[PDB]
């Protein structure tokens, strides 16, 4: 039982860490989107 | 000769006025472009 729980606890740490990486993959994507908007504004500056 | 110098002044003024009209027209064009830029600027903040 202790060894089985030991494995469950180990897994929980991995779960948190994959979730950390998963969150980064959504924040970074949002960052790519705000960058894309910025680029478009920069294009309008070229236009002006 | 007085009609001459008078006509000359009229011409110079006619052209000066055409120039101010040109400049104000141009100013409007730049303002409109700048508004598009400010709109993108807000979208960027919304993306942030």
JSON list of C-alpha atoms in Angstrom, two decimals:
[
{"chain": "A", "resi": 1, "resn": "UNK", "atom": "CA", "xyz": [0.00, 0.00, 0.00]},
{"chain": "A", "resi": 2, "resn": "UNK", "atom": "CA", "xyz": [2.80, 2.41, 0.86]},
{"chain": "A", "resi": 3, "resn": "UNK", "atom": "CA", "xyz": [4.60, 1.66, -2.38]},
{"chain": "A", "resi": 4, "resn": "UNK", "atom": "CA", "xyz": [1.38, 2.07, -4.34]},
{"chain": "A", "resi": 5, "resn": "UNK", "atom": "CA", "xyz": [0.81, 5.46, -2.74]},
{"chain": "A", "resi": 6, "resn": "UNK", "atom": "CA", "xyz": [4.42, 6.34, -3.34]},
{"chain": "A", "resi": 7, "resn": "UNK", "atom": "CA", "xyz": [3.74, 5.91, -7.03]},
{"chain": "A", "resi": 8, "resn": "UNK", "atom": "CA", "xyz": [0.54, 7.98, -6.80]},
{"chain": "A", "resi": 9, "resn": "UNK", "atom": "CA", "xyz": [2.36, 10.83, -5.12]},
{"chain": "A", "resi": 10, "resn": "UNK", "atom": "CA", "xyz": [5.15, 10.73, -7.66]},
{"chain": "A", "resi": 11, "resn": "UNK", "atom": "CA", "xyz": [2.57, 10.91, -10.42]},
{"chain": "A", "resi": 12, "resn": "UNK", "atom": "CA", "xyz": [0.87, 13.91, -8.82]},
{"chain": "A", "resi": 13, "resn": "UNK", "atom": "CA", "xyz": [4.09, 15.84, -9.07]},
{"chain": "A", "resi": 14, "resn": "UNK", "atom": "CA", "xyz": [4.37, 14.97, -12.73]},
{"chain": "A", "resi": 15, "resn": "UNK", "atom": "CA", "xyz": [0.76, 16.02, -13.18]},
{"chain": "A", "resi": 16, "resn": "UNK", "atom": "CA", "xyz": [1.50, 19.42, -11.76]},
{"chain": "A", "resi": 17, "resn": "UNK", "atom": "CA", "xyz": [4.54, 19.77, -13.95]},
{"chain": "A", "resi": 18, "resn": "UNK", "atom": "CA", "xyz": [2.84, 18.78, -17.17]},
{"chain": "A", "resi": 19, "resn": "UNK", "atom": "CA", "xyz": [0.17, 21.31, -16.20]},
{"chain": "A", "resi": 20, "resn": "UNK", "atom": "CA", "xyz": [2.80, 23.95, -15.76]},
{"chain": "A", "resi": 21, "resn": "UNK", "atom": "CA", "xyz": [4.11, 23.29, -19.22]},
{"chain": "A", "resi": 22, "resn": "UNK", "atom": "CA", "xyz": [0.57, 23.16, -20.55]},
{"chain": "A", "resi": 23, "resn": "UNK", "atom": "CA", "xyz": [-0.19, 26.55, -19.11]},
{"chain": "A", "resi": 24, "resn": "UNK", "atom": "CA", "xyz": [2.96, 27.96, -20.72]},
{"chain": "A", "resi": 25, "resn": "UNK", "atom": "CA", "xyz": [1.82, 26.65, -24.06]},
{"chain": "A", "resi": 26, "resn": "UNK", "atom": "CA", "xyz": [-1.33, 28.72, -23.79]},
{"chain": "A", "resi": 27, "resn": "UNK", "atom": "CA", "xyz": [0.27, 31.86, -22.45]},
{"chain": "A", "resi": 28, "resn": "UNK", "atom": "CA", "xyz": [2.96, 31.80, -25.09]},
{"chain": "A", "resi": 29, "resn": "UNK", "atom": "CA", "xyz": [0.35, 31.30, -27.74]},
{"chain": "A", "resi": 30, "resn": "UNK", "atom": "CA", "xyz": [-1.49, 34.35, -26.42]},
{"chain": "A", "resi": 31, "resn": "UNK", "atom": "CA", "xyz": [1.84, 36.23, -26.60]},
{"chain": "A", "resi": 32, "resn": "UNK", "atom": "CA", "xyz": [2.21, 35.25, -30.24]},
{"chain": "A", "resi": 33, "resn": "UNK", "atom": "CA", "xyz": [-1.22, 36.73, -30.83]},
{"chain": "A", "resi": 34, "resn": "UNK", "atom": "CA", "xyz": [-0.48, 40.05, -29.19]},
{"chain": "A", "resi": 35, "resn": "UNK", "atom": "CA", "xyz": [2.74, 40.15, -31.17]},
{"chain": "A", "resi": 36, "resn": "UNK", "atom": "CA", "xyz": [0.82, 39.54, -34.37]},
{"chain": "A", "resi": 37, "resn": "UNK", "atom": "CA", "xyz": [-1.41, 42.49, -33.54]},
{"chain": "A", "resi": 38, "resn": "UNK", "atom": "CA", "xyz": [1.60, 44.63, -32.84]},
{"chain": "A", "resi": 39, "resn": "UNK", "atom": "CA", "xyz": [3.09, 43.71, -36.20]},
{"chain": "A", "resi": 40, "resn": "UNK", "atom": "CA", "xyz": [-0.03, 44.81, -37.92]},
{"chain": "A", "resi": 41, "resn": "UNK", "atom": "CA", "xyz": [0.12, 48.18, -36.17]},
{"chain": "A", "resi": 42, "resn": "UNK", "atom": "CA", "xyz": [3.72, 48.47, -37.29]},
{"chain": "A", "resi": 43, "resn": "UNK", "atom": "CA", "xyz": [2.58, 47.88, -40.83]},
{"chain": "A", "resi": 44, "resn": "UNK", "atom": "CA", "xyz": [0.09, 50.69, -40.51]},
{"chain": "A", "resi": 45, "resn": "UNK", "atom": "CA", "xyz": [2.95, 52.90, -39.38]},
{"chain": "A", "resi": 46, "resn": "UNK", "atom": "CA", "xyz": [4.70, 51.98, -42.64]},
{"chain": "A", "resi": 47, "resn": "UNK", "atom": "CA", "xyz": [1.57, 52.94, -44.42]},
{"chain": "A", "resi": 48, "resn": "UNK", "atom": "CA", "xyz": [1.44, 56.35, -42.73]},
{"chain": "B", "resi": 1, "resn": "UNK", "atom": "CA", "xyz": [1.74, 98.94, -64.31]},
{"chain": "B", "resi": 2, "resn": "UNK", "atom": "CA", "xyz": [-0.50, 99.18, -61.25]},
{"chain": "B", "resi": 3, "resn": "UNK", "atom": "CA", "xyz": [-2.91, 96.70, -62.69]},
{"chain": "B", "resi": 4, "resn": "UNK", "atom": "CA", "xyz": [0.10, 94.57, -63.29]},
{"chain": "B", "resi": 5, "resn": "UNK", "atom": "CA", "xyz": [1.41, 94.57, -59.75]},
{"chain": "B", "resi": 6, "resn": "UNK", "atom": "CA", "xyz": [-2.12, 94.18, -58.49]},
{"chain": "B", "resi": 7, "resn": "UNK", "atom": "CA", "xyz": [-2.64, 91.12, -60.63]},
{"chain": "B", "resi": 8, "resn": "UNK", "atom": "CA", "xyz": [0.63, 89.75, -59.49]},
{"chain": "B", "resi": 9, "resn": "UNK", "atom": "CA", "xyz": [-0.42, 89.97, -55.85]},
{"chain": "B", "resi": 10, "resn": "UNK", "atom": "CA", "xyz": [-3.71, 88.33, -56.66]},
{"chain": "B", "resi": 11, "resn": "UNK", "atom": "CA", "xyz": [-1.97, 85.46, -58.30]},
{"chain": "B", "resi": 12, "resn": "UNK", "atom": "CA", "xyz": [0.42, 84.95, -55.43]},
{"chain": "B", "resi": 13, "resn": "UNK", "atom": "CA", "xyz": [-2.45, 84.90, -53.02]},
{"chain": "B", "resi": 14, "resn": "UNK", "atom": "CA", "xyz": [-4.53, 82.60, -55.17]},
{"chain": "B", "resi": 15, "resn": "UNK", "atom": "CA", "xyz": [-1.73, 80.12, -55.01]},
{"chain": "B", "resi": 16, "resn": "UNK", "atom": "CA", "xyz": [-1.05, 80.60, -51.29]},
{"chain": "B", "resi": 17, "resn": "UNK", "atom": "CA", "xyz": [-4.64, 79.77, -50.56]},
{"chain": "B", "resi": 18, "resn": "UNK", "atom": "CA", "xyz": [-4.51, 76.71, -52.73]},
{"chain": "B", "resi": 19, "resn": "UNK", "atom": "CA", "xyz": [-1.55, 75.62, -50.67]},
{"chain": "B", "resi": 20, "resn": "UNK", "atom": "CA", "xyz": [-3.25, 76.00, -47.35]},
{"chain": "B", "resi": 21, "resn": "UNK", "atom": "CA", "xyz": [-6.16, 74.02, -48.68]},
{"chain": "B", "resi": 22, "resn": "UNK", "atom": "CA", "xyz": [-3.80, 71.31, -49.78]},
{"chain": "B", "resi": 23, "resn": "UNK", "atom": "CA", "xyz": [-2.10, 71.16, -46.45]},
{"chain": "B", "resi": 24, "resn": "UNK", "atom": "CA", "xyz": [-5.30, 70.89, -44.45]},
{"chain": "B", "resi": 25, "resn": "UNK", "atom": "CA", "xyz": [-6.56, 68.21, -46.73]},
{"chain": "B", "resi": 26, "resn": "UNK", "atom": "CA", "xyz": [-3.39, 66.26, -46.18]},
{"chain": "B", "resi": 27, "resn": "UNK", "atom": "CA", "xyz": [-3.60, 66.64, -42.46]},
{"chain": "B", "resi": 28, "resn": "UNK", "atom": "CA", "xyz": [-6.91, 64.87, -42.49]},
{"chain": "B", "resi": 29, "resn": "UNK", "atom": "CA", "xyz": [-5.41, 61.94, -44.35]},
{"chain": "B", "resi": 30, "resn": "UNK", "atom": "CA", "xyz": [-2.75, 61.44, -41.73]},
{"chain": "B", "resi": 31, "resn": "UNK", "atom": "CA", "xyz": [-5.18, 61.70, -38.88]},
{"chain": "B", "resi": 32, "resn": "UNK", "atom": "CA", "xyz": [-7.27, 58.96, -40.35]},
{"chain": "B", "resi": 33, "resn": "UNK", "atom": "CA", "xyz": [-4.28, 56.68, -40.69]},
{"chain": "B", "resi": 34, "resn": "UNK", "atom": "CA", "xyz": [-3.31, 57.44, -37.11]},
{"chain": "B", "resi": 35, "resn": "UNK", "atom": "CA", "xyz": [-6.75, 56.46, -35.92]},
{"chain": "B", "resi": 36, "resn": "UNK", "atom": "CA", "xyz": [-6.34, 53.04, -37.47]},
{"chain": "B", "resi": 37, "resn": "UNK", "atom": "CA", "xyz": [-3.07, 52.78, -35.62]},
{"chain": "B", "resi": 38, "resn": "UNK", "atom": "CA", "xyz": [-4.65, 53.68, -32.29]},
{"chain": "B", "resi": 39, "resn": "UNK", "atom": "CA", "xyz": [-7.33, 51.07, -32.88]},
{"chain": "B", "resi": 40, "resn": "UNK", "atom": "CA", "xyz": [-4.73, 48.40, -33.37]},
{"chain": "B", "resi": 41, "resn": "UNK", "atom": "CA", "xyz": [-2.94, 49.69, -30.28]},
{"chain": "B", "resi": 42, "resn": "UNK", "atom": "CA", "xyz": [-6.03, 49.08, -28.22]},
{"chain": "B", "resi": 43, "resn": "UNK", "atom": "CA", "xyz": [-6.45, 45.59, -29.72]},
{"chain": "B", "resi": 44, "resn": "UNK", "atom": "CA", "xyz": [-2.91, 44.88, -28.66]},
{"chain": "B", "resi": 45, "resn": "UNK", "atom": "CA", "xyz": [-3.68, 45.87, -25.11]},
{"chain": "B", "resi": 46, "resn": "UNK", "atom": "CA", "xyz": [-6.75, 43.66, -25.18]},
{"chain": "B", "resi": 47, "resn": "UNK", "atom": "CA", "xyz": [-4.54, 40.81, -26.39]},
{"chain": "B", "resi": 48, "resn": "UNK", "atom": "CA", "xyz": [-2.22, 41.46, -23.45]}
]
